[PDB]
Amino acid sequence: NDISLIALLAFSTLLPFIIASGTCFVKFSIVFVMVRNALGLQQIPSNMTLNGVALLLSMFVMWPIMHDAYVYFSSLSKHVDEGLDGYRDYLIKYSDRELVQFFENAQLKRQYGEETETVKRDKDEIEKPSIFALLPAYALSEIKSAFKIGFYLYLPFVVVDLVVSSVLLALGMMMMSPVTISTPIKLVLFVALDGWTLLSKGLILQYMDIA
Amino acid sequence: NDISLIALLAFSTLLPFIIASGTCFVKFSIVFVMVRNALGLQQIPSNMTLNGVALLLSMFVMWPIMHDAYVYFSSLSKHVDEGLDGYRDYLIKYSDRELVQFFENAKDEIEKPSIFALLPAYALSEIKSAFKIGFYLYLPFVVVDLVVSSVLLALGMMMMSPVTISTPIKLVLFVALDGWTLLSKGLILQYMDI
Amino acid sequence: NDISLIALLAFSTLLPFIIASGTCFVKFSIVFVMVRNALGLQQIPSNMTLNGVALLLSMFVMWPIMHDAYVYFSSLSKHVDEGLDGYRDYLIKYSDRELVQFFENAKPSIFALLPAYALSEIKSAFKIGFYLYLPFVVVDLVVSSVLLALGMMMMSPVTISTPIKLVLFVALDGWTLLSKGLILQYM
Amino acid sequence: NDISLIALLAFSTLLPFIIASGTCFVKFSIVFVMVRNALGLQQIPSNMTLNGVALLLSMFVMWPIMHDAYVYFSSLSKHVDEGLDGYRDYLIKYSDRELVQFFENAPSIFALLPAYALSEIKSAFKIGFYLYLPFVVVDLVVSSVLLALGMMMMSPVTISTPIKLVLFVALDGWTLLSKGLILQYMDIA
Amino acid sequence: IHHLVASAALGFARVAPIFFFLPFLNSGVLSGAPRNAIIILVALGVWPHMIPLVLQEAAVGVMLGCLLSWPFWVMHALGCIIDNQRGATLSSSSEMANFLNMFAAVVYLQNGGLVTMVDVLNKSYQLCDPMNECTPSLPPLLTFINQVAQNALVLASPVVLVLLLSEVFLGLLSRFAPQMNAFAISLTVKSGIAVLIMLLYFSPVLPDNVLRLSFQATGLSSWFYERG
Amino acid sequence: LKEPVIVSKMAARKKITGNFEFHDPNALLEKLSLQLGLIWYFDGQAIYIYDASEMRNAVVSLRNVSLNEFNNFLKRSGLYNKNYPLRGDNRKGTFYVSGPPVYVDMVVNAATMMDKQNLGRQKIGVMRLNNTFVGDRTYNLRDQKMVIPGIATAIERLLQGEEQPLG
Amino acid sequence: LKEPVIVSKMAARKKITGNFEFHDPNALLEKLSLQLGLIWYFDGQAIYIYDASEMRNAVVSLRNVSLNEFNNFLKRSGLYNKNYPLRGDNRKGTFYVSGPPV
C-alpha cells in the first residue's frame, strides 16, 4: 500500500498546515510567546512546550467542529462543500469584515478584469464569501487580536522596569544593569496575580462559554 | 515491517511531545536555567546537559509508572483507559481541581475525570510552581550583587562594572552551600519519599 | 536496509546525550569558558574551538574504557549488564557515595551513577573556576584604584586591565598547564 | 537528484558570506556605523536601518555585474570561468596589485577576494577619520566655554550631544555622505 | 500542479522581508511553527495571475519593508533620545523605546493598519509585476536616512530643551557653592522631569503622528520604476 | 398546515417581518414562495422548502417501461406533483425531470429501480386437415419402392435447426 | 405516558417555559410536536423524539414479496404507523418510506 504514500506525504503536511495557519492555534502561540518576552526570559519555558500546550487548548476547542467533517465522510468539490459548512461559519465569526471584502475584490479584479463591479458590505445577508478569502484574513485578524492582548499584558512589567531604572539612577549606580534586580520582582507580579490561570481562563471564554 | 516503521518513527516523534509537556521534566528543566541565570552565566554549562540531568531525574518517578502499563497493556477501546489509569491517578495529584472542572464543563472517587481534560492543567500547574520556586533562588544572589555594587560606590569608583567582581562571590555562595545537590534532593523528595 | 541504519542513527541520537552529560567532557567544557570570561574576553576565541579541544582531550580517558566493549562484544539483553562494568568502575570512582545511595533509595546500578556523577562534575568545575577567577580580581582593583589616586574618576579601567590579564596568562602559560592539570586527575 | 537541491542549501547559507566579503557592502556598513559612533548616540539610526540602506545601495552596484552574467549564460566548468569575467574586471579596479600577485606567486578568482576586502577596510578607515574631525572641534569648543564660566565641574556630554545632533540633520548630513559614497562606485543619478 | 511551488516561491521572496522588518510580525511574536504557513497564504492570496529573479524580488521586498516600517522607526528613535537624556544609556559610551514602539504598533493596528498594508502590497503587483525588471529607484533612496532622524528630532524637541534648561539652572546653582556634587544631583531628577513633561503631550499629539507618517499606496510610483 | 415543515439552511438566511394572519395557508405559502423566491414540495408526510437556486434537473432513460405507465405509478402512489410534471414523449423511454432535490432524487431512483425490476407460455394446437393426407405415400415399380413425403415431413424439415427469432 | 422517552441530541437544544398539565398526554404531545417542530415515533417499548430536520427517506424495491404482503407483516407486528405510511402501487415491489431514522 505504498502507492498512496505520495498522497500521505501531502496529507500529513496539509493537516498541520491548517493547524498552523487557519485555526485558533495562532492566537495562543503568539500570546504565550509574548508573555515570555514580557517577563524577559529567552530560552525558558522552552517554546517546544508552549507549542504543545497551545495545541492542546486549540484541539480542545476544535474538537466539535472537526468531528462534523467526519460524521459526513468538479463533482467532488460540490460534495466537499456540504462537508465544509461548520468551518466556514467558524472562520466568518472571527475574521474581519473589512479584510474579507478586500480579499474578495482583489480576487474578482484578478479573475475577470479591471472593469469588474466592486463588491460592498451589503452582500453579507444571503451571500457567503468563499473559503479562499476567509483563510488569509483569519490569520491576520488573530495576529491583530493577539498583539492587542499582548500590549496590555506588556504594560505592568514596563511600569516595574521604569521605576527600577529610576531608583538605580537616584543612587549613583549608573554602571549597574537593572535586569539583575528587576527580574526577581517582575516574577512576583506573575505568581501573586496567577496569570497562567487567567490568560487560559479568558482565552477559552472568548471562543466557548460555561454553563 | 514497513507498516511498523511508521509506527516507530511516529512514536519517536510522539514521546518528545509527551515528555516535554506531561511529565516532571517541565518543572525540572526550568529551575536549572533559572539558577543558571541567577549566577550570571550565559553559555555555561550548555542547553544540552541540563536536559540530560533533568531527563535522568525525570525517569526516577516515571519508571514506576511506566512498568504498570507494560504489564497490563475493536477490543482496544477500553484496553487503553486502564493502561493509563496509573498515569491518570497521578495527574489528579499535581493539578488544580477547580481548573480541571473548568475544562471538563466547557464525585471524583466514583468517576475519575477525562484524560484530555487535566493534562493542560497539569502543565500550567507545573509552570506556575516552577516560577514560584524559581523566584526564591534569585534573592540571595541579588543581595550579594547589591552589596559589592554599593561598597564600590562607598568609594569613588562609580565607573566600574561589578560583574567582574560579583561572579567569583556568587559561585562560592553556591559551592559552600552545596547548591546543585541541594536542589536535586528537594526535587526528588517533593515527588518520591525516602 | 533502512531499519538497521535508522536504529544506528537512533544510537547516534543518544551519543551526544552521553558525551555531553555522563562523561569527563562535562568537566572539561566549563573551565575553558570560565577562563574565557575571566580574562575580560567576550567571545573572541570561539565556541567551536573550545568544544573541539575539550572533546579531543575528553577521548584520552574514554578510549581506554570503551575498548573493552569492542573486546567483549534475548541473548544480548542480559549480557549488556555483564560486560559494562568497566564504565561503572569509572562512574563509582568520581561520584559521591551518599548521592549514589540516595538515588538507589528514592554493585550499584548505572542509572543512579549517571546524575550523581554529572551533578559532581559541575560543582568541581565551579571550584576550579573560582580559583581561576581570583588572580584577576586583584589586577582589576589595583589598576582601577591608581586612577582614583589621580583625578581620573571618569575612566573605565577595562582597556588597561585587559592587557595585564592575558600577559599574566601567557607568563603562567595557563592553557597547557591547565590541560596537563586536568589530565593528572584521571591518568 | 537531491544533491542538486542540497547545493541550494550551499547557497542560502553561503550568500551572507559572499555579500559580506566581495560586495561593496563592506565599505558602506563600516562608514555608516562609524559616523554613528562619531555623533555620540549609539541607538540611532538603529542598525536594522543602517543595514537595510547599505544592502539596497549595494544592490544597485551589483546589478550591472549580475545582469551580464545572466545574458551570457572541466568541460561544462569551462562555461562559468567566462561568466565570472564581469565580476573579475570588478575585482581588479578596486584592489591593489601589490596584494593581487602576492597571493599568487607564493589573476585568479580565489586570489583577489582576500585582497579586495583588505583594500576596502583600508579605504573605509581613512574616510571615517576625516568624518571624525569636525565633531572633535565641536565638543572641544563647547567644553571650553563652560570653563570660561564657573562651570568647571558640570559634565559636557549631555550638552555636546544635542548641539552635535541638531547640526548634522540641519546641514543635511545623511544625504551628503550617502551621495558621496555611491559616487565613487557607480554613475549615480 | 508542480509549477505552483515556483509560483509560491516567487511570492514568498517578496513577502518575507516585509515580515522580517515590521514590529508585529518579527521572530519575537511569531515562532517557527506557524510562520512559514502565513506567508504562503498571503503570497498565494496576492498573486496577480532563473536564479536572479528571487534576488530582484527580494530587493523590491526590502524596499517595501522599510517603507512599511517607516512610522515605527520614528517612535523608537524618539524613545532612544528621551531615554538618553535622562541617563540610563551612558554605560556604553532600551527599556523606554520598546514601550513607544509597542504603543505605536497598536495605535497603528486599530484604525486601518493591515488594510493599508496589504493595499500597498497589492498595488505593488500593479506597477512592478515580475518578468518586467522592477527596481527600487535610487534617487529618492538617498534621503531616507535623513527623513527619519529629522522626524524624531522635531517630535522629541520639548523634552530635550527642558532637560537642557534643567542643566543650565543646576549648573548655575553650583557657581554659588561648588561643594554640591551637582552632577549626581541632576541625575536623580532628570528621570522624573522626562516623564512629567511627556505626560502633558503623550495623549493629544503622539497617536496623530503615527497616522501622519504612515506610507500609503498612492506613493508607489515615486519609489518603484520598471526597466522595460 | 397539518404537516411538519423542513426549511433548508440556504433558505433559512432570508428574513421576514409583519403581522400575518393564517386563514388560508395553502394560498399563503403559494404566494410567499413567489414573492420571496422559493420552491416547495409536499410528499404526504412533510413540507420541504428550498430556495429557488437549489433546483436540480436530470434526464433518465427507461429501457423497457413506458412513461405513461410510470406516470400511472406516480398517480396511484401519491407522489404526482402537477407543478413539476415529467416532460417527455408519451410512449418512449426518455424524459426530463426537474424540481426540488428530494423529488428529483426520488423519481430518478424509482425509475432506475423499475428498469432493474424488468415470457411466453407454451401452447398446443390441433389443426385438422380437410383436403390432404398426413404421412407418406408408398408405391412400387416392379422391384423398387418410392416414398413421397407428406405435409408433416415438409414442415418438419423447414423448422429444423433454425436458430431464428420467429414471432 | 407509560413508556420511557428518548430525546435526540439535536432536539435537546430547544427550551420551554410554562405551567403544564398532563391528563391525556398523547394529544398534548401531538400538539407540541407541531408547535415546536418535532417528529416522534412509538415503537412499542419507547417514544423516540427527533426534530423535523432529521426526517430521512429512502426508496427500496422488493424482489420476492409484495407491498400488501409486507403491510400485513407491519399490521400483525404492530410497527405500522398511520402518520407515515408506505407510498407505492398496491401490488408491486417498489415503494417509498419517510419518517424518523428509527
Which of the residues C42, C119, C138 would you substitute to probe the B interface, choosing the one with the greatest number of B C-beta atoms within 10 Å?
C119
Among residues A204, A195, A205, A165, the alpha carbon closest in space to that of A35 is found at A195
Categorise residue D46: left if φ over 0, alpha if ψ from -120 to 50, beta otherwise.
Answer: left
Among residues C143, C161, C121, C132, the alpha carbon closest in space to that of C25 is found at C121
Report CB contact under 8 Å: B12, C10.
yes
G99: chain F residues, CB-CB within 8 Å = 45
The CA distances from residue F16 to E174, F7, F31, F54, G53, in Å, are 83, 14, 14, 20, 21
CA separation for the pair E138, D183 (Å, rounded): 12
H or E element, residue B137: helix B115-151
Residues of A with CB under 8 A from a CB of B: 2, 43-46, 48-49, 52-53, 56-57, 60, 171-177, 180-181, 183-184, 187-188, 190-191, 194, 196-197, 200-201, 204, 208-211
Q: CB distance from G73 to chain F under 8 Å?
A: no
Total count of residues recorded for chain C: 187
CA separation for the pair A177, E188 (Å, rounded): 17
CA separation for the pair D69, D80 (Å, rounded): 9
Technique used by the depositors? cryo-EM
CA separation for the pair E180, D151 (Å, rounded): 13
**Declared resolution, Å:** 3.8
Counting Cα atoms < 13 Å in the Cβ hemisphere of E160 gives: 20
Other Cβ atoms within 10 Å of D171 Cβ, number: 8
Per-position b or e across B69-92, b if 16+ CB within 10 A of its CB: eeeeeeeeeeeeeebbeebbebbe
Total count of residues recorded for chain F: 167
Contacts of A168 (CB under 8 A, 6+ apart): A174, A176, A178, A181
- Nearest-CB residue to E149 (from D44, D57, D59): D44
With touching defined as 3+ CB pairs under 8 A, do chains E and A touch? yes
3-class DSSP assignment, residue F130: coil
Q: What is the CA radius of gyration of chain B?
A: 22
- In contact, F68 and F91? CB cutoff 8 Å: yes
Among residues A58, A55, A194, A188, the alpha carbon closest in space to that of B98 is found at A194
- In contact, E137 and D189? CB cutoff 8 Å: no
CA separation for the pair C76, B183 (Å, rounded): 38
CA separation for the pair F144, F146 (Å, rounded): 7
DSSP string, C85-122: HHHHHHHTTSS-HHHHHHHHH----STTHHHHHHHHHH
CA A25 to chain centre: 5
CA separation for the pair G43, G52 (Å, rounded): 18
H or E element, residue G98: strand G94-99
The CA distances from residue C13 to B62, C10, E13, F131, in Å, are 22, 5, 34, 112
Q: CB distance from A25 to chain E under 8 Å?
A: yes
Residue with cell 503631550: E201
CA separation for the pair F64, F117 (Å, rounded): 10
B171: chain C residues, CB-CB within 8 Å = 126, 129-130
Total count of residues recorded for chain B: 194
H or E element, residue G6: strand G5-7
Residue with cell 511570492: E11
Tell me whether residue G91 is exposed, middle or buried, using C-beta atoms within 10 angstroms of its C-beta: 0 to 12, 13 to 18, 19 or more: exposed
Contacts of B60 (CB under 8 A, 6+ apart): B188, B192, C103, C106
Contacts of C123 (CB under 8 A, 6+ apart): B175, B178, B180, B181
Q: What is the dihedral of CA D106, D110, D115, D116, to 10 degrees?
A: 160
**Omega before B120 within 30 of 0, i.e. cis:** no
Report CB contact under 8 Å: D56, E174.
no
Chain E touching partners, 3 or more CB pairs below 8 A: A, D
DSSP, res B156: T
Report CB contact under 8 Å: D49, E145.
yes
Q: What is the CA radius of gyration of chain A?
A: 23
The CA distances from residue B141 to A175, B172, D157, in Å, are 18, 11, 34
Residue with cell 568537566: C27
- In contact, E20 and E29? CB cutoff 8 Å: no
Indicate the pairing of strand F56-61 with strand E134-135: unpaired
F13: chain A residues, CB-CB within 8 Å = 125-126
Q: CB distance from G65 to chain F under 8 Å?
A: no
Indicate the pairing of strand F47-51 with strand F56-61: unpaired
Lookup: cell for A103? 480579499
Report CB contact under 8 Å: E191, A165.
yes
Report CB contact under 8 Å: E21, D48.
yes
E strands, D16-169, are: none
- In contact, F42 and F4? CB cutoff 8 Å: no
Other Cβ atoms within 10 Å of C101 Cβ, number: 13
Q: Which amino acid is at F18?
A: G
- In contact, D60 and D186? CB cutoff 8 Å: yes
Report CB contact under 8 Å: G57, F117.
no
- Nearest-CB residue to B159 (from C33, C119, C154): C154
CA separation for the pair F136, C70 (Å, rounded): 112
| Range 160-199 of E in CB contact (< 8 A) with D | 160, 163-164, 167, 170-171, 174-175, 178, 182-183
Q: Which amino acid is at F29?
A: L
- In contact, E117 and E225? CB cutoff 8 Å: no
Counting Cα atoms < 13 Å in the Cβ hemisphere of B62 gives: 13
Other Cβ atoms within 10 Å of C95 Cβ, number: 21
DSSP, res G54: G
CA separation for the pair C160, C172 (Å, rounded): 19
3-class DSSP assignment, residue C30: helix
Q: CB distance from D180 to chain E under 8 Å?
A: no
Tell me whether residue G43 is exposed, middle or buried, using C-beta atoms within 10 angstroms of its C-beta: 0 to 12, 13 to 18, 19 or more: middle
The CA distances from residue F51 to A113, F35, F101, in Å, are 31, 12, 11
CA separation for the pair B82, B89 (Å, rounded): 11
Q: Which amino acid is at C120?
A: S
Among residues F106, F11, F19, F23, the alpha carbon closest in space to that of F60 is found at F106
CA separation for the pair E53, B180 (Å, rounded): 56
- In contact, C182 and C28? CB cutoff 8 Å: yes
CA E99 to chain centre: 13
- In contact, F47 and F88? CB cutoff 8 Å: no
**Omega before F4 within 30 of 0, i.e. cis:** no
Categorise residue C45: left if φ over 0, alpha if ψ from -120 to 50, beta otherwise.
Answer: alpha
DSSP string, F53-103: GG-EEEEEE-SSS-HHHHHHHHHHHT---SSS--EE-TTSSEEEEEE-HHH
Report the residue of chain E nearest D160, measured CA to CA.
E164
- Nearest-CB residue to A49 (from B21, B142, B149): B21
Residue with cell 573560582: C130
Q: Where are the alpha helices (DSSP H) in chain E?
A: 4-21, 32-45, 53-68, 70-85, 97-107, 114-124, 144-174, 182-199, 202-212
CA A42 to chain centre: 21
Three-class HEC string of chain A: CHHHHHHHHHHHHHHHHHHHHHCCHHHHHHHHHHHHHHHCCCCCCCCCCHHHHHHHHHHHHCHHHHHHHHHHCCCHHHHHHHCCCHHHHHHHHHCCHHHHHHHHHHHHHHHCCCCCCCCCHHHCCCCCCCHHHHHHHHHHHHHHHHHHHHHHHHHHHHHHHHHHHHHHHHCCCCCCCCHHHHHHHCCHHHHCCCCHHHHHHHHHHCCCCCC
3-class DSSP assignment, residue G40: strand
**Omega before C16 within 30 of 0, i.e. cis:** no
3-class DSSP assignment, residue G47: strand
DSSP, res B161: -
Among residues E207, E61, E82, E51, the alpha carbon closest in space to that of E157 is found at E82
